[PDB]
Design a protein around this ligand. Structure first.
Ligand SMILES: [Ca+2]
Ligand SMILES: [Ca+2]
Lengths: 138, 138
């Protein structure tokens, strides 16, 4: 038994742990069956995706580029913003990944929503550096 | 005498109310003397600004363009994320403003920090649409 504030942090942090050790056989862990990944802002044009649509994007990316050394860490000096009543955790993050065409690195704001028990992830929302992601896509 | 959650939301909401009715004579309200404005991400290239450096940009923008009908509203469906222990409030916002070169409008993630009493703003951090802001400046 953990305090609800800490348990919300462990559950939200597992999202980044699952990405660092990602494997198609195991896949996505720590989420509900109806979890949704939201990409902010709406001007970027990315629609919301379920636990199965993100997998299809993962698989399609494996056939185009190689992805090695995923790394996620909080920005130094930032603290987890936790709202126990709404079951929400806010993170200020940086993501690192080695692609075939060099290095991927950007700065993000993550918003996690858990279930009532605070054990599984219900919603994951991330605000994205639009100028860099548009440049990476093009 | 309000509950801290409602008091933190009102103190953080005053930032948008002060901007909608901004007047150089009245100036910035609801902030401590050492309040710092932060513009995320760091890739955008905007240094942190004090209470007087933000006023200087306001003055410098009045000589080049005209700003009218400043509007701000929470994105429908979003709720204020409040961390009472950290004195932090998170918003999902849209800002509207009319300039000389058309309409300004974009989506934001706002993070506010208050004093121990929860009556004044100590820090305001905003993550912006980098692809749209670099288009507006150019
Ligand atoms: Ca970058
Ligand atoms: Ca826009």
């Amino acid at each position: 038994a953990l305090p609800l504030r800490e348990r919300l942090i462990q559950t939200a942090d597992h999202y980044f742990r699952n990405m660092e050790s990602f494997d198609l056989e195991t896949g996505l862990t720590g989420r509900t069956a109806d979890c949704i990944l939201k990409v902010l802002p709406a001007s970027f044009g990315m629609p919301d995706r379920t636990n199965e649509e993100c997998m299809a994007a993962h698989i399609a990316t494996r056939a185009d580029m190689t992805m090695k050394n995923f790394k996620a860490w909080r920005v130094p000096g930032s603290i987890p913003i936790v709202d126990e009543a709404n079951r929400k955790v806010v993170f200020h993050m940086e993501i690192y990944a080695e692609m075939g065409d060099g290095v991927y690195h950007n700065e993000f704001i993550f918003i996690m929503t858990t279930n009532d028990e605070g054990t599984l992830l219900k919603e994951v929302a991330e605000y994205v550096d639009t100028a860099a992601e548009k440049k990476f896509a093009a």
